[PDB]
Design an enzyme around this catalytic site. Structure first.
Site, mmCIF file in Angstrom:
data_model
loop_
_atom_site.group_PDB
_atom_site.id
_atom_site.type_symbol
_atom_site.label_atom_id
_atom_site.label_comp_id
_atom_site.label_asym_id
_atom_site.label_seq_id
_atom_site.Cartn_x
_atom_site.Cartn_y
_atom_site.Cartn_z
ATOM 1 N N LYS A 125 1.049 -4.388 -13.679
ATOM 2 C CA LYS A 125 2.011 -4.123 -12.923
ATOM 3 C C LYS A 125 2.381 -4.643 -11.973
ATOM 4 O O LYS A 125 3.230 -5.440 -11.497
ATOM 5 C CB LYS A 125 1.274 -3.137 -11.358
ATOM 6 C CG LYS A 125 2.018 -2.493 -10.053
ATOM 7 C CD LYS A 125 1.474 -1.188 -9.105
ATOM 8 C CE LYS A 125 0.463 -1.032 -8.685
ATOM 9 N NZ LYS A 125 -0.482 -1.018 -9.108
ATOM 10 N N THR A 156 2.580 -8.281 -12.629
ATOM 11 C CA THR A 156 3.276 -8.828 -13.423
ATOM 12 C C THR A 156 4.338 -8.665 -13.480
ATOM 13 O O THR A 156 5.762 -9.333 -13.550
ATOM 14 C CB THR A 156 2.516 -9.258 -15.080
ATOM 15 O OG1 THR A 156 2.789 -8.159 -15.623
ATOM 16 C CG2 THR A 156 1.198 -8.973 -15.043
ATOM 17 N N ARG A 188 0.477 -8.781 -1.766
ATOM 18 C CA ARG A 188 -0.736 -9.196 -1.394
ATOM 19 C C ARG A 188 -1.353 -9.679 -1.198
ATOM 20 O O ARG A 188 -1.456 -10.675 -2.341
ATOM 21 C CB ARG A 188 -1.108 -7.826 -1.360
ATOM 22 C CG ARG A 188 -0.714 -6.359 -0.777
ATOM 23 C CD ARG A 188 -1.554 -5.287 -1.327
ATOM 24 N NE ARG A 188 -1.133 -4.864 -3.035
ATOM 25 C CZ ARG A 188 -1.611 -4.184 -3.773
ATOM 26 N NH1 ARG A 188 -2.825 -3.024 -2.951
ATOM 27 N NH2 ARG A 188 -1.850 -4.477 -4.872
ATOM 28 N N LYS A 248 -14.362 -12.489 -11.718
ATOM 29 C CA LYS A 248 -14.023 -13.197 -11.593
ATOM 30 C C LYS A 248 -12.104 -13.357 -10.907
ATOM 31 O O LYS A 248 -12.110 -11.941 -9.924
ATOM 32 C CB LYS A 248 -13.107 -14.998 -13.266
ATOM 33 C CG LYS A 248 -14.194 -14.867 -13.998
ATOM 34 C CD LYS A 248 -14.376 -15.398 -15.108
ATOM 35 C CE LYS A 248 -15.670 -14.995 -15.894
ATOM 36 N NZ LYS A 248 -15.371 -16.331 -16.819
ATOM 37 N N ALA A 262 -5.957 1.119 -0.644
ATOM 38 C CA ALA A 262 -5.291 1.413 -1.021
ATOM 39 C C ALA A 262 -5.692 3.256 -1.146
ATOM 40 O O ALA A 262 -5.276 3.670 -1.604
ATOM 41 C CB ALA A 262 -4.565 1.544 -2.524
ATOM 42 N N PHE A 266 -2.973 0.865 -6.927
ATOM 43 C CA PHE A 266 -2.400 1.454 -7.668
ATOM 44 C C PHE A 266 -1.332 2.438 -8.180
ATOM 45 O O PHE A 266 -0.551 1.665 -7.711
ATOM 46 C CB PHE A 266 -3.440 2.723 -6.845
ATOM 47 C CG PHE A 266 -4.814 2.061 -6.657
ATOM 48 C CD1 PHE A 266 -5.589 0.865 -7.306
ATOM 49 C CD2 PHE A 266 -5.108 2.228 -5.217
ATOM 50 C CE1 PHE A 266 -7.516 1.344 -7.028
ATOM 51 C CE2 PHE A 266 -7.136 2.287 -5.272
ATOM 52 C CZ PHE A 266 -7.928 1.557 -5.668
ATOM 53 N N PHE A 300 3.143 -5.702 -26.092
ATOM 54 C CA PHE A 300 1.893 -6.258 -26.628
ATOM 55 C C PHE A 300 1.936 -6.880 -27.866
ATOM 56 O O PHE A 300 2.915 -5.164 -28.562
ATOM 57 C CB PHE A 300 0.037 -5.276 -25.794
ATOM 58 C CG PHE A 300 -0.975 -6.541 -26.360
ATOM 59 C CD1 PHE A 300 -1.478 -7.163 -25.195
ATOM 60 C CD2 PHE A 300 -1.890 -5.236 -27.304
ATOM 61 C CE1 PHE A 300 -2.324 -7.458 -26.006
ATOM 62 C CE2 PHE A 300 -3.228 -5.777 -26.945
ATOM 63 C CZ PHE A 300 -2.915 -7.290 -26.709
ATOM 64 N N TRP A 325 5.537 -11.509 -19.244
ATOM 65 C CA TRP A 325 4.122 -12.394 -19.626
ATOM 66 C C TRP A 325 4.031 -12.758 -20.412
ATOM 67 O O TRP A 325 3.186 -14.505 -20.553
ATOM 68 C CB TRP A 325 2.685 -10.700 -19.851
ATOM 69 C CG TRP A 325 1.442 -11.530 -20.133
ATOM 70 C CD1 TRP A 325 0.763 -12.022 -19.207
ATOM 71 C CD2 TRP A 325 1.000 -12.106 -21.367
ATOM 72 N NE1 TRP A 325 0.300 -12.893 -19.548
ATOM 73 C CE2 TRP A 325 -0.380 -12.933 -20.860
ATOM 74 C CE3 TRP A 325 1.742 -12.010 -22.572
ATOM 75 C CZ2 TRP A 325 -0.776 -13.229 -21.711
ATOM 76 C CZ3 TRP A 325 0.619 -12.913 -23.366
ATOM 77 C CH2 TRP A 325 -0.192 -13.646 -23.410
#
Lengths: 556, 556, 142
Positions: free
Chosen positions: A70, A72, A93, A104, A272, A300, A380, A409
């Protein structure tokens, strides 16, 4: 290379050079280092005249272990709009600092679609989350202080809705006993901590129009109940003013940039589930009055994030988005088709059709709001050509909607140009009325049933007694006309996290309800909600260090 | 007018201009708006081996209700030094946030001797107190977490010395039960919160030379014991690296200015009773290598702040003050003469002469270290031409010491040119080697007895059973050759806040001790100590606010 | 009855920092020296610090061994100061209307116990408080 290595290799513009491309003079920036600034209250007040450009909302499908990217798309789409000759700003945000140290941290986006500096966004960005932690901690302190000194308002220590906060992943502070150790210390009571972003103060931050409104809202917050069960407000314990002062600087939005030099605002960071999960209304409003396009996202998938971005944020503000992108990945759809995450490499067009069910509902839900929709597919390498082709076939045949492969990406702006071309088209084409999911003067329970039965596919709703009494209280005390913030799992349109795809005829049970009078919505609890995450057996913290050169390792 | 009216009326230099006066280029500056910058770590490192300038310690007589204006002398002194041509920088402590909402905040100095801007110094400043909180709050998290998942270290929940922190006067959190609510929340313990300021992280931050030293110090902090009484450090819970990572930006000193545009460093803010009461070592060290003269103060009078500043700071770090200024007001000395707060307006014949004994033991005390002294008397428009003339006599005859009248509060820099000339003359004169109060390789007991007999005016010291026991603990375990940090009232040289002047005979009863292994001192408790202060019945918070036009009221 | 008083309205304005009355059980139980009680939200009442002593520590036991009769026992219990109000005024067992109920609980008990020595001579065993925080004698009645 990893997202962090990509960010570190970037050569950031000084923020004054980012600021110009919106009309912001240097005189209007309060620098935080050389590549961050806040935009001064007076410059933002100065924009109340100016017309507003196109608002683009980036929601997604019901999340999966697999990821959908999302964030990205928000940054790539924004980059791409800039590239194709449209002046565009990203609204995002700030993430909690505390989860950086359990699991991480992570990029603001990913790969070649990022908002930077990455390291500063993750930790103490401009000190927003500290200011909220400080505002909240003062009203905590001042509440137990009122009770210590003759308890004038007759606060019932067993009826205090206000909890405390810290931006740490500290499971120890979930439920405490406090004001122990004797007379000088005060009246014992139960209390606990939520993580700072779960604070109603954070909701009000993100919905406030200006400092006047932040105080008016903060003073509506119901912190506790008296023994005779009358309400008590932050205004009653004389907290609003002091809190507003600790948020004066915070409430200015943060200007920052993508890897490709374009302007990006990062401001707010609420939950959310127990909140609306959008970034500050000041941020997006500031974007609309300075840019041709403003790209923002909602926490979300569109069953939770988009509904709230329309039914809570867009309804309070008057805002109306031009167009909505719904993000999907082939991997994510196949997981909603039954494929377990290990088996995701092998072509399975059967599993792809099954999980389209999930996407099919989101498109049909978002359209119900009279809003144009395009489907962003985040590419992908393992994705076969026939999988992408059958998704486009399915989207055109069933939903009459465009499915735009994006490779931002990997390729940055370029990979999202087709998608920018298609958003601009939705925006320029026929504008219909923005409808909502419920009328405001319906019963709360009817607002709940209307969301459950029209958007989740659910047969019915059930209100357990705990909540039935409180909804009966809320409606009698005149909060009846308030919106509904459905606190449930994100992993399914149902309350069962394991029911994937698009389940029909399930039951949504409301266990409990909370009142957020500050934000102006009713929190509706339909599962077990985390408000304070724990640390794992081996926290990221054990390996987070400075190397020789003083670089940060183990954070990403 | 009021300090804040004087502060607000000023036109401040862009911070890079103030920087220029210390050879710092705008490349080395991390801005926090226009009027504050942090000095870059790589720029501070390039100053190693560059030669030190003169170091001026500003201290005072025994605190009174009358006030002394220690911090006014410092900003005065540093401006005056610049007026008369010496290139000078003032170092100060950032004030705690929490007290601002209890009583009001204060000017950093006051009158025409202020460091600015005053609002940001009193509130979030550059988020350093926030960073320390975050770091302290991760250490607590990691400790509880370690117990939750297996408790491999065998930590005893009845014997954890580490407490939590928030930057708020919150009485409710002095004594806590945590890890309640069932299995998933962990192992019920007793816990408490101090203010952020009381943390050993703070005292470690103010003493670390660089990030390498910070990490080494954090990791030596003893945080609990195992059930079989083996000590457990922050290294044993693998906190140190991530504490350091969160403290990276913060350890850079914050560059500010005076109302005269002369450079001011503000960094650190530890207590002066359970810590060493000094600004950061990084600050004063950076100052020395960018400036000819470098002015820094320590909290309370020279019986504590000065003593600790020499036996802890200089001793650990290698520093020697070129000269010492002991601040005094007529109103304070008179108060030491028996005169109540209420009756200070009228000239007082003898009050001054019997109260002088308080200053008589301070000058003698500082000299006992081999340091040139000058008495700064901060003037007030009540002070007669006989009172000021009298004080100079007593200084001429009884000591061999100069008493210079300072009108820097009203006049500005010009009213401390006289004090400046004398500080110069002492710094570039006879420079005897630095003595300490006690030797290093001695019993910790002999170090306490030493301080109390040689400086406090005491006849002996008592050690209660509680303390006697723990010392024997510290002595066998290897912490025997550590400095001592006398926690004690500041109003008296004795343990009895009422005995003003220069009292002899008194006994110093040591009720408890504490180990700061990171800061590398043994805290020595005589009086009752308060690590978490409590809001008043009508706290300043209640009237803190913004105007129509958005100025802050209620905070001064 | 004290916590129940506090729970319904706190009519006597009892300060839960100022309760002197603790609880008892006759068991060497170190777990109960220092408790927090009245936890689990609204229906369980107002949380307060509290603790347990061993039954013989009880002032009830002191008053049992110094009672002349059932009438005396009820007055003595009547006078026990069990807490302070927020305005620092004393609160008794009579204020909490506990005195009569406690007396019927103690009625049969206040009759002394006859037993005998190995040589069949009469022996009275009645009561037994502490000789440190009470007077360490058997009952007057006995």
């Amino acid at each position: 290379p990893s997202d962090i290595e990509i960010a570190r290799a970037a050569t950031l513009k000084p923020i004054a050079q980012v600021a110009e491309k919106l009309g912001i003079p240097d005189e209007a920036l309060h620098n935080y280092g050389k590549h961050i600034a806040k935009i001064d209250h007076d410059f933002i007040a100065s924009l109340e005249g100016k017309p507003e450009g196109k608002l683009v909302l980036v929601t997604a499908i019901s999340p999966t272990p697999a990821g959908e990217g999302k964030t990205t798309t928000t940054v790539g789409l924004g980059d791409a709009l800039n590239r194709i000759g449209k002046r565009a700003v990203m609204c995002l945000r700030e993430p909690s600092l505390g989860p950086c140290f359990g699991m991480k941290g992570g990029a603001a986006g990913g790969g070649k679609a990022q908002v930077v500096p990455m390291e500063q966004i993750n930790l103490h960005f401009t000190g927003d989350f500290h200011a909220i932690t400080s505002a909240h901690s003062l009203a905590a302190a001042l509440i137990d202080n009122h009770i210590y000194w003759a308890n004038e308002l007759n606060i019932d220590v067993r009826r205090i809705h206000w909890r405390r906060v810290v931006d740490m992943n500290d499971r120890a502070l979930r439920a405490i006993n406090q004001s122990l150790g004797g007379v000088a210390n005060g009246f014992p009571r139960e209390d606990g901590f939520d993580i700072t972003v779960a604070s109603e103060v954070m909701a009000v931050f993100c919905l406030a129009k200006n400092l006047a409104d932040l105080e008016e809202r903060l003073g509506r917050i119901v912190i506790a109940e008296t023994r005779d069960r009358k309400p008590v407000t932050l205004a009653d314990v004389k907290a609003t003013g002091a809190m507003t002062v600790l948020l004066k600087d915070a409430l200015q939005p943060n200007l920052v940039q993508t890897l490709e030099g374009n302007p990006a605002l990062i401001h707010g960071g609420p939950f959310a589930n127990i909140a609306h999960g959008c970034n500050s209304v000041i941020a997006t409003r500031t974007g609309l009055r300075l840019a041709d396009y403003t790209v923002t996202e909602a926490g979300f998938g569109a069953d939770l994030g988009a509904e709230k971005f329309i039914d809570i944020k867009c309804r309070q503000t008057g805002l109306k988005p031009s167009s909505v992108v719904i993000v999907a990945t082939i991997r994510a759809l196949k997981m909603h088709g039954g494929v377990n995450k290990k088996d995701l490499q092998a072509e399975n067009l059967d599993a792809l059709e099954k999980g389209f069910a999930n996407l099919e509902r989101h498109v049909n839900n978002v359209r119900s709001f009279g809003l144009p929709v395009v489907v962003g597919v985040n590419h992908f390498f393992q994705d076969t050509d026939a999988e992408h082709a059958r998704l486009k076939e399915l989207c055109r045949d069933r939903l009459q909607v465009e499915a735009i492969t994006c490779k931002h990406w990997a390729e940055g702006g370029a990979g999202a140009e087709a998608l920018a071309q298609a958003v601009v088209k939705l925006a320029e084409g026929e504008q219909k009325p923005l409808t909502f999911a419920y009328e405001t003067e319906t019963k709360i329970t009817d607002k709940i049933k209307a969301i459950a039965t029209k958007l989740y596919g659910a047969a019915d709703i059930q209100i357990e007694s705990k909540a039935a009494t409180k909804l009966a209280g809320f409606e009698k005390d005149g909060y009846g006309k308030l919106p509904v913030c459905m606190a449930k799992t994100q992993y399914s349109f149902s309350t069962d996290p394991t029911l994937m795809g698009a389940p029909s005829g399930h039951l949504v049970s409301v266990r409990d309800v909370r009142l957020s009078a500050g934000a102006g919505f009713v929190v509706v609890i339909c599962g077990e909600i985390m408000t304070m995450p724990g640390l794992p057996k081996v926290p990221a913290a054990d390996t987070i260090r400075l190397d020789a050169n003083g670089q940060i390792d183990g954070l990403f």
